[PDB]
């Protein structure tokens, strides 16, 4: 069914803040291809009291060059306005993410079964621009029971309100705030805690590695954890010592937690609890705002290269993938010219082990060799340089993409 399948393990940490969040890095996103019309189904498997039940979702066409966050086109077996309980957001560097609200019921079940709903695994089906069906599987190594409830908004109104607005972009927050302390020029058993609130969602974060009793002048890095589904890219925070009234001693602090999603709403608020010699005692808050930025890096990271030979008979010994299964059960290689024009025509350059060169897509050719390196052959090169895009993958490989500039011969 699936032409390439990727397994993954989901890592909860702490209480569920109000939504599930999954990151899928392996899917491809070609560079320079603004007509990259990818199509996606999403399937979720729910275990409600021991009964295996499913929830399929449709997301339709993708326009990475123009749109970032996608609401489902439809759903099967959902509750009232079920499609409005999901989101799929691009993140850049060929990465994307999936989010689902968990404080409301996704699917319909009879009275008594509501408390028993739990998630076992998720599948993401991904039709490529070239038609290839990529797939992802995520397994809740330890499921979680869902708890429906309309949790309130909580305001720590007695908190000092600094005006540096927290801009959430690409699910990854990054904000730096100043601090005024009663001296504490050296360790005062500093501890910090953060909380984000809005629209039923509550994200609370804690220090890893204990608490601060080992300050140094200058910069001070420390790890953090947020109650949620931690990203494969870690959360973190860094403190900075001071600058060059009432004995106020200046400090500045930087943070970046990134299991953060838009379900908080444009109205949500962040809360930061820190402490000197006192779970946090000194407070600062800051309003949350979500950027409508389109991720400007969705192009898959490219092995940028330049090539040159005589005439139009140019070639390129295309290497293996990173971490290839040498015996290569099933393999696929595809390429196209930069900034293509027509979806039907410019995207017919595919090869496999069994399938030689098919119809369509002239100017290109190639095959594997006893070298096992794919020696590609091209023709019809113009009087000026042109750029070529190439992608390769084998079973249980990690996808590799090459950017090859066929620079014309010099003077």
């Amino acid at each position, epitope marked *: 069914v699936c032409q390439y399948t990727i397994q993954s393990l989901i*890592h909860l940490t702490g209480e569920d803040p109000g939504f599930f969040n999954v990151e899928i890095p392996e899917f491809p996103f070609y560079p320079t291809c603004n007509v990259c019309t990818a199509d996606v189904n999403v399937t979720i498997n729910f275990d409600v009291g021991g009964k295996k039940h499913q929830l399929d979702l449709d997301f339709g066409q993708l326009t990475p060059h123009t749109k970032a966050v996608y609401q489902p086109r439809g759903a099967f077996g959902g509750s009232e306005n079920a499609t409005n309980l999901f989101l799929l957001e691009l993140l850049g560097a060929g990465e994307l993410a999936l989010t689902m609200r968990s404080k409301k019921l996704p699917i319909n079940v009879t009275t008594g079964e509501e408390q028993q709903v739990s998630l076992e695994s998720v599948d993401v089906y991904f039709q490529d621009v070239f038609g290839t069906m990529w797939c992802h599987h995520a397994e809740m190594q330890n499921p*979680v029971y869902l708890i429906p409830e309309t949790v309130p908004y909580i305001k720590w109104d007695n908190c000092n309100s600094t005006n540096i607005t927290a801009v959430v972009r690409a699910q990854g927050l990054d904000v730096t705030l100043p601090l005024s302390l009663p001296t504490s020029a050296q360790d005062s058993n500093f501890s910090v805690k953060t909380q984000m609130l809005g629209n039923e969602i509550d994200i609370e974060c804690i220090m890893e590695d204990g608490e601060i009793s080992q300050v140094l002048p200058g910069d001070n890095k420390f790890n953090i954890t947020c109650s949620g589904y931690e990203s494969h890219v870690p959360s973190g925070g860094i403190l900075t010592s001071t600058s060059p009234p009432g004995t106020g001693y200046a400090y500045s602090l930087r943070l970046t937690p990134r299991p953060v999603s838009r379900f908080l709403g444009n109205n949500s608020i962040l809360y930061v609890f820190y402490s000197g010699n006192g779970g946090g005692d000194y407070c600062i808050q800051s309003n949350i705002v979500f950027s409508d930025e389109i991720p400007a890096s969705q192009d898959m990271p490219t092995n940028t290269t330049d090539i040159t030979y005589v005439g139009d008979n140019a070639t390129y010994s295309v290497p293996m993938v990173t971490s290839e299964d040498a015996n290569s059960p099933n393999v696929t290689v595809t390429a196209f010219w930069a900034w293509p024009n027509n979806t039907e025509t410019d995207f017919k350059c595919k090869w496999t082990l069994t399938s030689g060169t098919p119809s369509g897509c002239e100017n290109i050719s190639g095959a594997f060799a006893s070298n096992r390196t794919f020696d590609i052959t091209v023709s019809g090169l113009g009087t000026a340089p042109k750029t070529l895009i190439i992608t390769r993958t084998a079973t249980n490989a990690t996808t590799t993409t090459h950017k090859v500039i066929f620079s014309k011969a010099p003077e």
Partner: antibody
Amino acid sequence: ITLKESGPTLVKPTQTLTLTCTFSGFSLNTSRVGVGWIRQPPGKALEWLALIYWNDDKRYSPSLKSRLTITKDTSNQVVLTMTNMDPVDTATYYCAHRYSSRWYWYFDLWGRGTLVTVSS
Amino acid sequence: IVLTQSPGTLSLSPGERATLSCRASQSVSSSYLAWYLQKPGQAPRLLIYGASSRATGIPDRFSGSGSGTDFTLTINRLEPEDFAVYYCQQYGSSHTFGQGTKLEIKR
């Protein structure tokens, strides 16, 4: 918070085994709490047996789901049941408490346990 | 679904440090493991979560570690009070316990 075990400390081979856990300091009709049983055949390792949650879902040891049932009787009682006994089942049996609802999870509190002998 | 601990009945002098390994065949989501303590004639006591998080009443005198296929437990400044049986339990999957380690004072 406390838990107590109760049941027959001797059962005949192939007969049925019934053990009751009585507890105080928490309510299970309210949320987030789960109760389960663990056993230790003297000297051997601990073996998890069964678990039941506030939402009344029940999950058992995979190899012993064929012979087990765990139920709920009063505001403060949980009853385990085990069938088709064999003398190798002879072990000390515990019932324990959990405060989370994260499916598979640690055990926070423990009863002092009660021994079950299995022999004619 | 398996756990395997260090040798049995380790005998140490008080004031030394304990070193208990809890190796595993499949890598649990390393955030999810606990350590337990039982003394014959009593019932098991809870010690640790995620190999580092300490339960109520427990002092700094205890420290676990490790991830995936290997989790480790240590006890500092050994006291005669401490010498009993020890276990490691995995969650994040079907519940399973190690086969146990035991402690003896080298009087």
